Ligand binder design. Structure first.
Ligand SMILES: CCCCCCCCO[C@@H]1O[C@H](CO)[C@@H](O)[C@H](O)[C@H]1O
Ligand SMILES: CCCCCCCCO[C@@H]1O[C@H](CO)[C@@H](O)[C@H](O)[C@H]1O
Ligand SMILES: CCCCCCCCO[C@@H]1O[C@H](CO)[C@@H](O)[C@H](O)[C@H]1O
Ligand SMILES: CCCCCCCCO[C@@H]1O[C@H](CO)[C@@H](O)[C@H](O)[C@H]1O
Ligand SMILES: CCCCCCCCO[C@@H]1O[C@H](CO)[C@@H](O)[C@H](O)[C@H]1O
Ligand SMILES: CCCCCCCCO[C@@H]1O[C@H](CO)[C@@H](O)[C@H](O)[C@H]1O
Ligand SMILES: CCCCCCCCO[C@@H]1O[C@H](CO)[C@@H](O)[C@H](O)[C@H]1O
Ligand SMILES: CCCCCCCCO[C@@H]1O[C@H](CO)[C@@H](O)[C@H](O)[C@H]1O
Ligand SMILES: CCCCCCCCO[C@@H]1O[C@H](CO)[C@@H](O)[C@H](O)[C@H]1O
Ligand SMILES: CCCCCCCCO[C@@H]1O[C@H](CO)[C@@H](O)[C@H](O)[C@H]1O
Ligand SMILES: CCCCCCCCO[C@@H]1O[C@H](CO)[C@@H](O)[C@H](O)[C@H]1O
Ligand SMILES: CCCCCCCCO[C@@H]1O[C@H](CO)[C@@H](O)[C@H](O)[C@H]1O
Lengths: 313, 313, 313
């Protein structure tokens, strides 16, 4: 036996239900046009919710029995960010469940919103005390607490009818994104990331697409100048990351590639709005199909790894 | 006697009339709803104006008789920024006086606008020559010449009826803010500030709230998507700074805490617009009351220090 | 004879047809108000096109016979950016030619759009692998592939009737600008540029003005809040650069000053829209006259250098 061993569920694995849940919601937003999309959405949503329940129970066990492992990830100026996946996914599962039970959905949405805001207020701000975060801590994962969590609150609160509160969270996320990205890309240019962190390059896809998806959730799918602007930068980053992909996976394909699923799923979700708004419909179809294929491949890779006993640690 | 001694009025003390003047204007913008607000506004405005006159005379004496002390602050890549408080407050006193004498108000507004634009044009640009500003010069005080001064011109010019000119200054300030903040927050994460500078952390509260207050001044109080976005990031920063407050005041409460008053007063001012627009009225009431209490505490602390002979150097 | 010698046309000389072509387009947009502007526009456009043809042929010769010289500029994390001038100018010549032959214009616009997007996708993204770009590589020239090229595609695609595609390129450029500038200005504050690179300070004038010109091209000249905001920051930078000009030219006037022509020409172009929108007409006239005088001086300086055998290497 081992004196200690890393917990079998890495915190980052919450990216799996994140990607699936967000994709569920994208398909939900096609039911208006193609009713069969609802079936696809419901299946994705149930799968995402089941995985989320499992991973929540797993993390509760980690908290109870391996608390010092949680404490170390929490105080790390790099690893803390993955904890934000927990409230993010809680909110997304709420959004799914709203179709069946708005009361339970609302409870999950508030828990995740309060949770994420408390988390950032405690930890993101603490970094400003200096001396712990280093230049080498400037990782794409920082987008999770700083940006993605706020966008998720924005769209979830809008779903509940709190549009103006949603706009506050939206603004927090959008300005936080624009304020962080400059220093991230400069860091990547000079130093980049070591292979072990490179899959997290996929999170760089997320901001513009998660931003526009949240924006369109609040504004009832009105595809305006801001929405088009966001899509343009989002596609620029997609092209860049496609070119970089062989480098990203230099040391092999791995489960970390779920990092891409936040941007991919939000590409799909926002595409449904562009399509329905009759804006760039051809691009929209491409984006929706591309992102589904990509996430499909992540799912097949993940099943392969599970099949081989190479998923949990 | 002393060969030399620091001048008794630190340049930063212009933050006192700044906070009071801006708060006067917030109360002025409640007269529409509650006429008694005018009395509160007039008292704040008179007090702010009297303090400003005193401090202007004091600084004129510093210029005449201690010019090398001014020169050293001016050429410092850190301390130069506080000089921008002079034209900022000149403009704010003009805005107050407009209620009684638009001619004198207009003169003050132009003096402060020309003054601040000349100041930045001379000094902010000079930094781009390199070799003087250092990484450790990356302080929140830079927001004063770069951001706050432009927003103040924007709203003061709008008051005079020059809305389109006001939008030019508004854009200068808003884009300058977004262009500086990324590097400021990265610096704070890595190095932070020494206790002696930490109260200036309060200036980090200012940008979003000063921005939205200026925006709403130009646009006749129309609370739109941009306004809501700005408030959201503003409240994020408020939460962060509240969490950081014990650290900010690690070495004790001090007069430097007037740094917070620009953001606090602009929180109050913008709240009056949100309230009147029937947007987030409960948040608005909270924000207005909170910021008044906070500034009230600054005033009581300041009276205490004066009472004890611990205000002037 | 020499074993090797730098090619006689520096890649940066494509800034000459850029400035002239963009200025042609500014005058074109005055024909509505003053028909004689068309003659001025046509002359500028023909001159720009002729120079562009020459320089394209020259660069094709460089590619064929001095390929390793191109390869070295391409792989440089600093010098690669000037290559973007080639597709940028290709697009601008297309915009000119559209007045006479929309078919040929469309071909040039697509070639330049595909070319610039391929170029950035290959090279700008590659920088994110780290270890090649250094802090000292943080130069204004980076705006050429990252920002200017996207804005040029935006307005050229709008000219062809592809407004929504144009908005995608517009957003890519605008967000890329805001994401790069923070780190550029911090670098200039700390380290600046050596005299040999200082003329490229002129490119700092470009972003806001090129941005607003592209925006107004897409949106049919509607001078709205965004347009005014952009002009305000653009003029701030103009003032800063005017103050810095003696420093910029410390070691003498040189052909590198064509770096300013992208911002100058776009100042002129956007002024035509402000004027026609009856927004800040006096500022507009000033801006249009100023930028024409400036570019006129660049032309006279260039003729002088050609006259003296000091243009080509
Ligand atoms: C998702 C939940 C993450 C929470 C991690 C909490 C980190 C706790 O932090 C610790 O709390 C201890 C008390 O229990 C204190 O003794 C320590 O000072 C502090 O490190
Ligand atoms: C997803 C929601 C997680 C919130 C739980 C965090 C509670 C931990 O406790 C808090 O953590 C601090 C964080 O910097 C520690 O310094 C202190 O113990 C305390 O402030
Ligand atoms: C960081 C990039 C932010 C860009 C924000 C774009 C400014 C908003 O764009 C606005 O869109 C409106 C609706 O489409 C139009 O009516 C306005 O004319 C336009 O200015
Ligand atoms: C977000 C993108 C998902 C929507 C995919 C819709 C694909 C349907 O395809 C479209 O069907 C239309 C009739 O309904 C036809 O007029 C179009 O030619 C066809 O492209
Ligand atoms: C609010 C006003 C601040 C102005 C500070 C001015 C700094 C002056 O600067 C100095 O000017 C001198 C001449 O008087 C020159 O001898 C010096 O070179 C220069 O340092
Ligand atoms: C609030 C308005 C203050 C403007 C006064 C500044 C005048 C000082 O004089 C100017 O100052 C320069 C600034 O870099 C010095 O280098 C030079 O003396 C001169 O340019
Ligand atoms: C840095 C963050 C900048 C965000 C700017 C928000 C873009 C403007 O937002 C615009 O607001 C208008 C009025 O409410 C709406 O009519 C438009 O639909 C919306 O795009
Ligand atoms: C910017 C916030 C300052 C405005 C404070 C207004 C507080 C008044 O209070 C409000 O009065 C209303 C009637 O006038 C009632 O309908 C509301 O229930 C009550 O909250
Ligand atoms: C405007 C056009 C610029 C293109 C520059 C291309 C840089 C080419 O790059 C080179 O390509 C070679 C093959 O020809 C390879 O041998 C090299 O690995 C690679 O350096
Ligand atoms: C203006 C349009 C120029 C596009 C031509 C570039 C083609 C060069 O070839 C490409 O260049 C790479 C760039 O990083 C090299 O690494 C590889 O050869 C290849 O990817
Ligand atoms: C980086 C700076 C981005 C600023 C974008 C400004 C947000 C858009 O500004 C919008 O302009 C519209 C048309 O004029 C107005 O109708 C809206 O009220 C206003 O919010
Ligand atoms: C982009 C700026 C270029 C336009 C320059 C136009 C200058 C014309 O000048 C204007 O002519 C008007 C009548 O046409 C008069 O009413 C105005 O007084 C005069 O300033």
């Amino acid at each position: 036996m081992n004196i200690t061993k890393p917990f079998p569920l890495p915190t980052g694995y919450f990216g799996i239900p994140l990607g699936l849940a967000a994709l569920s919601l994208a398909w939900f937003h096609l039911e208006n046009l193609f009713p069969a999309a609802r079936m696809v959405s419901d299946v994705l949503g149930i799968v995402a919710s089941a995985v989320w329940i499992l991973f929540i129970l797993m993390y509760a066990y980690k908290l109870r029995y391996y608390f010092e492992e949680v404490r170390a990830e929490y105080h790390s100026p790099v690893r803390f960010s993955f904890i934000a996946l927990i409230p993010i996914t809680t909110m997304l599962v709420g959004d799914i469940l709203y179709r069946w039970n708005p009361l339970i959905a609302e409870v999950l949405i508030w828990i995740g919103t309060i949770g994420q805001l408390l988390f950032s207020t405690l930890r993101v701000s603490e970094l400003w005390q200096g001396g712990v975060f280093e230049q080498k801590s400037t990782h794409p994962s920082f987008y999770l607490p700083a940006v993605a969590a706020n966008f998720t609150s924005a769209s979830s609160l809008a779903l509940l009818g709190y549009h103006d509160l949603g706009y506050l969270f939206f603004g927090a996320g959008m300005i936080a994104w624009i304020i962080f990205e400059p220093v991230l890309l400069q860091h990547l240019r000079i130093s980049s990331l070591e292979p072990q962190f490179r899959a997290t390059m996929g999170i760089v896809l997320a901001p513009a697409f998660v931003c526009v998806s949240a924006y369109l959730s609040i504004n009832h799918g009105e595809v305006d100048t801001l929405a088009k602007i966001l899509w343009g930068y989002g596609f620029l980053q997609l092209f860049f990351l496609l070119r970089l992909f062989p480098w990203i996976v230099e040391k092999g394909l791995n489960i970390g590639l779920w990092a891409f699923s936040a941007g991919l799923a939000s590409m799909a979700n926002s595409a449904t709005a562009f399509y329905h708004g009759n804006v760039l419909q051809g691009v929209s179809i491409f984006a929706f199909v591309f992102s589904n294929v990509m996430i499909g491949l992540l799912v097949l890779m993940t099943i392969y790894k599970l099949t081989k006993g190479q998923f949990f640690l």
